[PDB]
Ligand binder design. Structure first.
Ligand SMILES: OC[C@H]1O[C@@H](O)[C@H](O)[C@@H](O)[C@@H]1O
Ligand SMILES: [Cl-]
Ligand SMILES: [Cl-]
Ligand code: NA
Ligand code: NA
Ligand code: NA
Ligand code: NA
Ligand code: NA
Length: 324
């Protein structure tokens, strides 16, 4: 009854909660757990999964750093009859993936796009408004979905000249942030401020696909930008970002309750290991390159400073001390 749980890094906040919640809920359900974090190093994650298999893990729950990097080791699991659940991020180009548990990532993107569209009055305004864009790591299939959802809302207005991206970086490849790194985002935003918004130009919005990139952006804006504060989006309700929202430095975030995701994954583990139907609610949205992966999509929730206490504190997700 040993289950392996592979998380990408502790340096991006949520995975600390994902891993802890997985471990707690698996142990409550009667499993033994081998939980490991890979410091966002792909070869480390590969070696950790190899070791889980060697230690006799009967099922693998994997939150991959790079979606297409695990093909060899997952073939080993498949050969041994070990089921694989892709956790939050989809594992790509492998026929070894049994199930996928995540939040509705396209909807996350939609919400971020619609927020900017609403606050900039794009349905009725001539503009132009100045936009910059920061998305996630190109090896994370989720980043494609966050970008795609937001762009499906906003791209028509960029095409129409209502939104202007002064840096010229609009394409996914140009706006992706390696490792979802706060520091990398900060360095790029600093260069964009210095090059394009050091004169009187107002930066009206920054579409950030998550909180770690938003944090880098707001760090740079604090340091170097002298104009009226832009719309800044995000996702995860990281503690640093919630505190920034309380100080007016981030507009909104998206709350994804990792306890709920973990609960759904343990239902899948139980179905596989003890018997039953693994819960799924989508076998149409996520093709991993080998084919459709049966998925369970949890609902993401809009958060801002007017509902964060109800969402995060009254729900028991954070303690009140954490947000001081
Ligand atoms: O950790 C960086 C990002 O990774 C994505 O795959 C997750 O869906 C996000 O919730 C997270 O902010
Ligand atoms: Cl780590
Ligand atoms: Cl750029
Ligand atoms: Na933890
Ligand atoms: Na690393
Ligand atoms: Na509006
Ligand atoms: Na089953
Ligand atoms: Na179902």
């Amino acid at each position: 009854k040993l289950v392996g749980v592979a998380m990408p890094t502790k340096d991006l906040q949520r995975w600390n909660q994902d891993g802890s919640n997985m471990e707690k809920q698996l142990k409550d359900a009667g499993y033994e757990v081998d939980l490991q974090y890979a410091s966002n190093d792909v070869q480390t994650q590969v070696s950790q999964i190899e070791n889980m298999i060697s230690n006799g893990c009967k099922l693998l729950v994997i939150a991959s750093i790079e979606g297409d990097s695990l093909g060899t080791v997952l073939a080993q699991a498949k050969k041994k009859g070990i089921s694989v659940i892709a956790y939050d991020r989809l594992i790509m180009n492998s026929d070894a993936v049994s199930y996928y548990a995540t939040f509705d990532n396209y909807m996350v993107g939609t919400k971020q796009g619609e927020y900017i569209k609403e606050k900039l009055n794009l349905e009725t305004a001539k503009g132009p408004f100045n936009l910059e864009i920061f998305t996630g790591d190109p090896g994370d299939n989720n980043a494609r979905f966050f970008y795609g959802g937001a762009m499906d809302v906003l791209k028509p207005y960029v095409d129409g000249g209502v939104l202007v991206v002064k840096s010229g970086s609009v394409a996914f490849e140009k706006v992706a942030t390696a490792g979802w790194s706060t520091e990398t985002a900060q360095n790029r935003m600093d260069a964009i401020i210095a090059s394009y918004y050091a004169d009187g130009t107002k930066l009206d919005a920054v579409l950030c696909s998550n909180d770690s990139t938003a944090l880098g952006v707001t760090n740079a804006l604090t340091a170097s930008y002298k104009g009226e504060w832009p719309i800044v989006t995000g996702q995860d309700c990281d503690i640093a970002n919630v505190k920034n929202m309380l100080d007016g430095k981030q507009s909104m975030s998206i709350f994804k309750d990792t306890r709920t995701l973990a609960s759904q994954v343990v239902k899948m583990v139980d179905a596989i290991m003890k018997g039953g139907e693994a819960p799924v609610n989508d076998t149409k949205s996520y093709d991993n390159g080998n084919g459709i992966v049966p998925s369970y999509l949890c609902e993401p929730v809009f958060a801002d400073a007017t509902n964060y206490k109800e969402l995060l504190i009254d729900s028991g997700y954070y303690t009140e001390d954490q947000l001081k």
